[PDB]
């Protein structure tokens, strides 16, 4: 069968903890007052929740209320526990309350509001300096949650709220986050298609924090090359072919050989043979101002098939790409 794997950092953080920290099913939810919140407008709806802009009538502050659908209502304790564990951490969204919605009869999570700009408009305006600055801010959130024994598992532009006017960032939507336990086999049906790491695409279940670093590399490549998304798969199978057209098939086969993974035979007729492309292939007159030797080297060290080879969040923060960012 497959060769096992472990994180190279923060490996044993959860085993030292009292079970209270990570045994989310044993957690007793403290409920707030639903009447403190007045819903203002519906912001969105997904398969797992309905999201509303609301006002906290006790302090007249704007908040966001995520009312969980019955399908997400099952693993609510995991999201609550993770949000409470990470509360106050750098660039982590603050969970302000947990109330019972009177209409849905399901839990409603109340978060602080962030004045975000949709990435489809915002990413087009970012300068080279801004991409470095905001990437460093995301890394602070990722190193914090990883150091706390938690993988986000859904890093993508829609889950990074940026108040560009105030140069403030928050990492949101912890509904897919999970506690890392060495040797644990996890569900590969996590993250969004274009941000899924090769470990998920080849059905390797013993993954870790490094999944988030692949997703972050996908965001970086889209930002510096002005190509949204960078790996534009039509489905989860074509997603791996798109990756292989850039990183090459030889390193893909070495990755699966190292972990003794057997690729789904449906890849035999679609993967082909591709060499690794040099990152300069993606540079053109319209994105050249966002590209530097440091950006390319940093990206090259995130976008690796082997999850164990990728930079950790703390190693990423040490990279020369961030030397120009004021700290
Ligand atoms: N804390 C928050 N502050 C402000 N806006 C928020 C906050 N949390 C979520 N939102 C906004 O709520 C809206 C609906 O959220 P939702 O997750 O359902 O959709 P989405 O952002 O398009 O994500 P997805 O790509 O996963 O479908 C989005 O416009 C999102 O930016």
Cβ neighbours, 10 Å, residue 36: 17
Resolution (A): 1.4
Query: What is the token pair recorded at 149?
Result: 């024994």
Distance 203 CA to ligand 1 centre (A): 28
- 68, 109 Cβ separation under 8 angstroms: yes
Q: Which two tokens stand for residue 73?
A: 């209502």
Buried residues in 237-260 as b, exposed as e (16+ CB within 10 A) = eebbbbbbbbbbbebbeebbeebe
Which are the catalytic amino acids?
154
Domains defined for the chain, CATH in brackets:
5-22+114-327 (1.10.510.10), 23-113 (3.30.200.20)
Q: What residue ranges line ligand 1, CB within 6 angstroms?
A: 43-44, 46, 51, 64, 93, 111, 113-114, 116, 158, 161, 172-173
83 within 8 A of 36, measured Cβ to Cβ: no
Name the experimental technique.
X-ray
Instruction: Output the six-digit token pair for 224.
Output: 């510096």
Instruction: Find out whether 62 and 113 touch, Cβ atoms under 8 Å.
Output: yes
Q: Which stretches of 61-117 are DSSP H helices?
A: 76-86
Q: What is the whole-number distance in angstroms between the Cα of residue 158 and the centre of ligand 1? A: 7
H/E element, 140: helix 128-147
How many other C-beta atoms lie within 10 A of the C-beta of residue 114?
A: 18
> What backbone torsions phi and psi does residue 142 show, to the nearest 5 degrees?
-70, -45
Ligand 1 center to residue 228 CA distance, Å?
19
């Amino acid at each position: 069968g497959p060769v096992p794997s472990r994180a190279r950092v923060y490996t044993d953080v959860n085993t030292h903890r009292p079970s209270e920290y990570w045994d989310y099913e044993s957690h007793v939810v403290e409920w707030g007052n639903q009447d403190d919140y007045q819903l203002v407008r519906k912001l969105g709806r997904g398969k797992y929740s309905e999201v509303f802009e609301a006002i906290n009538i006790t302090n007249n502050e704007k908040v966001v209320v995520k009312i969980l659908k019955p399908v997400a209502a099952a693993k609510i304790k995991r999201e609550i526990k993770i949000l409470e564990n990470l509360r106050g951490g750098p660039n982590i969204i603050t969970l302000a309350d947990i109330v019972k919605d009177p209409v849905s009869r399901t839990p409603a999570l109340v978060f602080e509001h962030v004045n975000n700009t949709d990435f489809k408009q915002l990413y087009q305006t970012l300068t080279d300096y801004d991409i470095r600055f905001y990437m460093y801010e995301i890394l602070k959130a990722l190193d914090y949650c990883h150091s706390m024994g938690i993988m986000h598992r859904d890093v993508k532009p829609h889950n990074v709220m940026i108040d560009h006017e105030h140069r403030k960032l928050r990492l949101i939507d912890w509904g897919l986050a999970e506690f890392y336990h060495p040797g644990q086999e996890y569900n590969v049906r996590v993250a969004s298609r274009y941000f899924k790491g090769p470990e998920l695409l080849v059905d390797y279940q013993m993954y870790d924090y490094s999944l988030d670093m692949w997703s972050l590399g996908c965001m970086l490549a889209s930002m510096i090359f002005r190509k949204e998304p960078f790996f534009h798969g039509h489905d989860n199978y074509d997603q791996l072919v798109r990756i292989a057209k850039v990183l090459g098939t030889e390193d893909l086969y070495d990755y699966i050989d190292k972990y003794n993974i057997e690729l789904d035979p449906r890849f035999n007729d679609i993967l082909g043979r591709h060499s690794r492309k040099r990152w300069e292939r993606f540079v053109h007159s319209e994105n050249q101002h966002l590209v530097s030797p440091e950006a390319l080297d940093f990206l090259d060290k995130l976008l690796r098939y082997d999850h164990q080879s990728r930079l950790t969040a703390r190693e990423a923060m040490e990279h020369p790409y961030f030397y120009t960012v004021v700290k």
